[PDB]
Symmetry: C5
Subunit: 307 residues, 5 copies
């Protein structure tokens, strides 16, 4: 029951696909397992590159195919190389870049908690066993990750485990257990751009939306809350150009709905103030003076936004 020692060098994790729950990993893969001793020219290990590996397999060299369980489709293998040793052992070294899949909760948006994962596991081989797994995270923790979209938590987490497949084959005297390495890498989103060029101006607009109560006339109060209405729509549109398409409402997405609400409340009170009277065109002296009543009736509905 063969022993394989894996080493996976992560080079870059880049381009997260928010809708599809997908990210890209470029790196190298190394596998080493010890075989029947061999006569190597010189007595120095043999190096077999690219084209030439398929040839040694055709001669009878076993090289197991190991699959990225959670990869999308099939990845882009750069330079492969077999290093064959005189005393038997064989080191397989391939550079790769490919798209991976994991569960990805983007709900708490621009303050985001994510984890990138690879899953390696021998494709066709039951009892060959992944010995020990190593992971070399190149790029560094605090560094210049302000140039970078993501900050990694985070040194690489490993986990060799055994996975059982229920629906097995026409072999069953105890043959459904495959050796799976699982590599995790925690990360957090760089909440910069989204705070300053996003949350803040949306706030200023929500804020200035309230200065509709400091207009004198009733006519001025209603008509102004209309260009206010469409200032929100014009903003949502700008949100739709920059923000990543999702199937749930993000933090930002809500703030923007709160905007529509604050101004639709405004419209209701402004119209209420004018036709709740005893004597003619008498605007409700006190209600029109919620000037600084629902700015903190929003910071109050807005501390229950944060349950």
């Amino acid at each position: 029951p063969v022993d394989v020692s894996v080493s996976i060098f992560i080079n870059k994790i880049y381009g997260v696909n928010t809708l599809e729950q997908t990210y890209k990993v470029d790196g190298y893969i190394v596998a080493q397992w010890t075989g029947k001793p061999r006569k190597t020219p010189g007595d120095k290990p043999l190096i077999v590159e690219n084209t030439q590996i398929e040839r040694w397999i055709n001669n009878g060299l076993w090289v197991p195919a190991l699959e990225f369980i959670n990869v999308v489709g099939s990845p882009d293998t750069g330079n492969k190389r077999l290093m064959l040793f005189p005393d038997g052992r064989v080191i397989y070294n391939a550079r790769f870049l490919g798209s991976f899949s994991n569960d990805m909760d983007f709900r708490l948006f621009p303050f985001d908690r994510q984890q990138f994962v690879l899953e390696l596991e021998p494709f066709s081989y039951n009892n060959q066993q992944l010995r020990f797994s190593d992971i070399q995270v190149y790029t560094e923790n605090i560094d210049n990750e302000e140039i970078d979209e993501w900050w990694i938590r985070g040194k690489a987490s490993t986990h060799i485990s055994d996975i059982r497949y229920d629906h097995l084959s026409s072999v069953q005297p105890n043959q459904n257990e495959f050796s799976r390495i699982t590599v995790r890498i925690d990360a957090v989103r760089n909440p910069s751009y989204y705070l300053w060029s996003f949350i803040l101006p949306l706030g200023l607009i929500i804020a200035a939306s309230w200065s509709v109560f400091w207009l004198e006339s009733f006519s001025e109060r209603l008509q102004t809350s209309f260009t206010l209405m469409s200032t929100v729509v014009a903003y949502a549109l700008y949100t739709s150009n920059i923000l990543p398409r999702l199937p749930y409402t993000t933090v930002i997405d809500q703030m923007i709905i709160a905007g529509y609400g604050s101004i639709f409340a405004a419209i209701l009170l402004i119209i209420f103030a004018h036709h709740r009277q005893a004597n003619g065109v008498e605007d409700d002296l006190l209600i029109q003076r919620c000037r600084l009543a629902f700015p903190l009736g929003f910071l109050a509905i807005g501390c229950v936004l944060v349950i």
Copy 2:
């Protein structure tokens, strides 16, 4: 007349192409059919991976090519492997990812009823028969499908059937009947994002559109419904950024037309109220007071769009 036993593991169904009626399916394919007994090294089944399969076919091993009837173009086969048994039987195992086609009615938009389908059928072989078909849908019961775009109904539906091709070959003594597996998987769209950040604010804008009648002057009433007009256009524009391009009008698409309608009605009544009088500038006392007459003359044309 050969018996083939198929097993199809669905891994992910992702990325629906709304215009092209296309979706992506990642999974494994398994086929098993029993052949002439064979001498296998050891007396344990033989494993043949990737490169090596073509070699056994070149020696004379039959392996049938089975086509995804409804795939688009040709898919991305990851790791293939033949498992050859001593007693004859052969298991073919390949991982795949590829784009599929089905009819797709998106009319009832954000509350959407869809079904994903595979169609497998032997490419060139008349009498070899698909025995029984199995389908392993990877998730379960009460999940986290709120992270996910689609909810599956839905345990996999199967259906082995016989399909006849009218325009056949130069063989015809009863040879036009191919064995076709058909796998269905029902699903529903996660109406979340589209309700909260879409239907609702469109409603609030439709609603507030009506508070044009609570303006005093006639001048105020007409001029306001103009910025109201373009508030709708600025909204439709935001719809065009997020919503999926279609060749029919969706539910949302209609609501937005109703918006244009309500405000064009407004412009008609507002101008009518002013010039339906006697000899002067006497606004029609009662008509201008449809204030809460066609908000429920809208909720009334509104057991129509989805009734």
Copy 3:
């Protein structure tokens, strides 16, 4: 001079590229020509799939390469298969998907008259001849083509013809005439979405644009036609998000220019009415009353594209 019998099964015609005059066709191709009789294992026709075809060609089997003349680049051939008969004849069967080119006039936009074309023609062979051509349009008539973007007219049109190339080779004793099948499929665009969510609201905006004349003041009349101006610009922008990029003006594209015209006419008259007087601030009593004069000077004076 060899006789080849072609059969082309169209499966889907999807994804029109409006700028590049390109569409995608997924289907099967069948070619059958009779050769020197052969010893086939059993005495049943031989089936040769994929990998194995190149092997028979290497042994000496002729299989002609036939080119899609009007394809873009080179297509995506799925499953090929040779069926070799004992009495000689050979049937070539390949599934394909690829991008095609034809002239495409999108001028009369959302009411669109288009025709999809394949052109098959033996690549390197002068006297081998395309016998007869068959075309199996799967995709059906009054069906559910409301789910579909295009309606096909339209049963497939054929046409085997001979095409002569002027600039020939160093062979010329009558050798410049190649056998070309040409398959046409007429189609019309589903003018749904574009009428309802496009032509109509553009009309309502053009319409309501005219109610600028029913404002009292001159100040109200000018200032209002300005937000009216940019309502059009905001609309064109929404046009730009949904409509397919072209190098000519479509029907819609014009209607939108008529919008800019109507409102620039408005600006002219409104300013004229105010400074054409037999006095001081006396608005031209009658000119300001073109209220329902150029709404039907628009349904008119610009109504001759049906010339």
Copy 4:
């Protein structure tokens, strides 16, 4: 020193990448050079297609690799074919589609002067010589180039020349001179769409921008030029949806800056007219009457731009 006769058939030149200075060319390539006489089955020329060419090269047939100097990356070769003659000569015929590079000045935008270029030149071969070059431009002189994005000038320009590489090899007794065909095809952009749906409405908006001076009040004159300001911004946005991304300012791009200028001039004069006085709130009687002074102070500083 071998004589090669080239023939290049241009089929389509489509999809210009404005940023990257890239265009696509689909066509055929033909090379003919005479070799040592050969025994051809029959005594008719031999035809070798696709798979089979590599086989004759493996036997020792020289076929030179000729490179598109200015191609991007490496192209998509469709059907290749060697035609081998009994008297020696060899005709190489390949269909191709690939992306090419040339210098591309888009400055004078929608009235555009462009030229598409191929550069063919033997990859590894010093003294083999490109004999004479032929170019068959399919697309026509008097046509329907209104369906087409570009109009070709323009019959194909040729030019076989010798090019010297300074930094050569370890061969230098006069060995740095390679034979290069250079094919040019002049073209002009179809200024249609951009005149009618772009330049014109930008003009009307520039025009109507001036009718700000025909407002009575000073309040009306300032406040109106603001919605006028953002009408320009809303237009520039529409520009950004349809126009091709560039690294310089186009003709249109300027016209749009002139728009921002005219209205920022307006804001300056309008505010000047109000506080350049004698008796209090006395608007400068004459300055406010530049009503038709800087519309032709724009047709004046605007015609120095181009000319």
Copy 5:
């Protein structure tokens, strides 16, 4: 310990991916190392092209695989060619185009300081040594780089160095040192388009935003700063169409936040001026006259934006 002489010809550096920190380089690669003398047909160097190189490697010709360390995935190798000399030496010549990665700070946006990098290094070979490195920057001086997006500083910088890998193999008696060429090319962004069609109009809008103080009424002053508010939002939206998506705030991105600030300040002062009085509707005589107080209280704030 083998000596390799590298020569890298840069043809084009194009298409920078701002988010992924990626650029494309098209060029040629040359490697020359001297081997055991050889019998070459004639006694002139042998030329081996494309298909044929793999054949000589199969015979036993060593050709080392050299990897672009920093490339993304794996590049597009055009025409390869071995030139084998009688005296042993071998020149390897390949054309390539591929995507590379470097750190890329876009913070100081449209005035941008960037450097493009290649890293070459023998994939599997410890003691073979990169001799000397040459780099032929075709692309030119002061030239016509106004047609071009980038201006190169900048003649090519080289640097052969030794790199040590900590986590090495089962070989360790001093075997972890690989020979790495590193080629740098400095560049600056063409600040044209972004100055004229971007910074400037953003300035005019910021500028004209201040003429809100030269309105008479208080009602006019508040209501106008609202359309002023959404003039900024409409601008940011135009920013989002043209500017490259980033994860930090650029120069421009700030200027635009300053806009939102200036107008939210305005709204604050304008509302302050009105309710900071004795008793009645007496606008604060002096505060309303910050007319030209915070235009230079902005040229004072947007000036510690560099210091």
